[PDB]
Design a protein around this ligand. Structure first.
Ligand code: KU9
Ligand code: MN
Ligand code: MN
Length: 180
């Protein structure tokens, strides 16, 4: 049962991203062959995380997402004991060595306001920073602190709208937007 959305994900994202997304999905007991919309969402969120960490200086960001869930925690306690930051209940996506906070990245196909609220009520941990990106170019960050400069964020927004267009050109966008 091979879908069009699966082969599009394989062609749209680089192999290191696809491989990390694949291992992550099966690690949590889900199949990219059938949960193909979610497959696209993880690859997208993963690519945004990597683009984000490339937006700062050389070694400003520590990347948590994409790691195996045990090692992703391992680096968190190391960070927590090193900087004295509260250990989050949820696994965050990044750590900003410059701002000394964990970051949760969000990528949404719906309204940016509502998704932040959902992510804020679920986190309930005031320490971690929250940064939401939309497939139409809206971004929302905790305390209106968007961490990176405009150029790095604009690059992420541009790629998101390219992913949207490519899905739409293949009639897969409507299914993707309704799946979230
Ligand atoms: O880290 C996350 N989930 C863990 C657990 C897990 C499970 C499967 C595969 C991978 C992972 C890692 C994580 N989850 C989410 C979303 C909403 C909250 C639950 N959720 C999902 O389970 C859906 S999948 C997804 C969808 C969109 C973007 C990114 C992802 Cl992964 N949104 C994030 O921004 C995030 O970082
Ligand atoms: Mn995550
Ligand atoms: Mn995230």
């Amino acid at each position: 049962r091979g879908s069009h959305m699966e082969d599009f994900v394989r062609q749209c994202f680089n192999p290191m991203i696809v491989e990390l997304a694949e291992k992550a999905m099966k690690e949590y007991g889900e199949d990219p062959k059938i949960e193909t919309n979610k497959f696209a969402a993880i690859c997208t969120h993963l690519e945004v995380c990597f683009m984000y960490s490339d937006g700062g200086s050389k070694h400003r960001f520590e990347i948590i997402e994409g790691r195996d869930r045990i090692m992703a925690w391992t680096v968190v306690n190391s960070i927590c004991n090193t900087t004295g930051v509260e250990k989050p209940k949820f696994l965050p996506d990044l750590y900003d060595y410059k701002e000394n906070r964990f970051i949760e990245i969000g990528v949404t196909r719906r309204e940016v306001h509502i998704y932040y609220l959902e992510k804020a009520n679920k986190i309930k941990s005031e320490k971690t920073h929250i940064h939401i990106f939309s497939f139409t170019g809206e971004e929302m960050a905790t305390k209106a602190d968007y961490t990176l400069d405009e150029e790095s964020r604009a690059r992420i927004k541009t790629r998101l709208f390219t992913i949207r267009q490519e899905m739409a050109s293949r009639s897969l966008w409507d299914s993707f937007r309704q799946s979230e």
